[PDB]
Amino acid sequence: QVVHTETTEVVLTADPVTGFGIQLQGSVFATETLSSPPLISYIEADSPAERCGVLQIGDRVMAINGIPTEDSTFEEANQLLRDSSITSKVTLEIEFDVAES
Numbered sequence: 001q002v003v004h005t006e007t008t009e010v011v012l013t014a015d016p017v018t019g020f021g022i023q024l025q026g027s028v029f030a031t032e033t034l035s036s037p038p039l040i041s042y043i044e045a046d047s048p049a050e051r052c053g054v055l056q057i058g059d060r061v062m063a064i065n066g067i068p069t070e071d072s073t074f075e076e077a078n079q080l081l082r083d084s085s086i087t088s089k090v091t092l093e094i095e096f097d098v099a100e101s
Contacts, residue, residue, distance in 0.1 A: 004098030007063075010055055012048050013089040020081040020090075021047020024061050026074040037062060038069045038077040040094065063093030 014020060021044025027036025040059040043050040062068050064080045084090030 001101050002098065005096070007093060007095045008054070008059070009091055009093055010049075010052060010059070011089055011091045012052060012055075012084065014085050015048045018044065018047060020049065020084065022049030022055065022081070024077040024081070026069065026072040026077055028072065028074045035072060037072055038074065040092075059092075059094035059096055061092050061094050065090050065092070068093075 012020065012022070022040060023042035024038050024040045025042070026038035027034045030041065038061055040049075040055070040061055041057045043055065043057065049055045061077065064077075065083060067076070067080055069076050080090065080092075
């Protein structure tokens with residue numbers, strides 16, 4: 001159970017069905033804590049994020065498509081996901097903390 005902590009660059013592509021079944025809450029749309037920054041905490045059983053083979057609940061998004069969000073803006077996160085349609089794909093910079101090997 002080694003302890004780690006790094007940032008990952010997960011580039012996703014808007015699926016022709018749903019697009020981005022993955023949701024990121026800025027500690028506002030969840031009863032668990034609030035007034036906090038935006039992060040990933042929701043994936044679909046058929047979304048590019050789930051099938052990305054490198055995404056899960058816990059990823060701290062703080063630099064998506066350039067926009068690292070300001071303080072806390074849930075609406076901002078959703079906007080970034082929708083702004084991915086422009087290029088058909090987005091690059092979300094997240095931070096993970098390994099705590100189990």
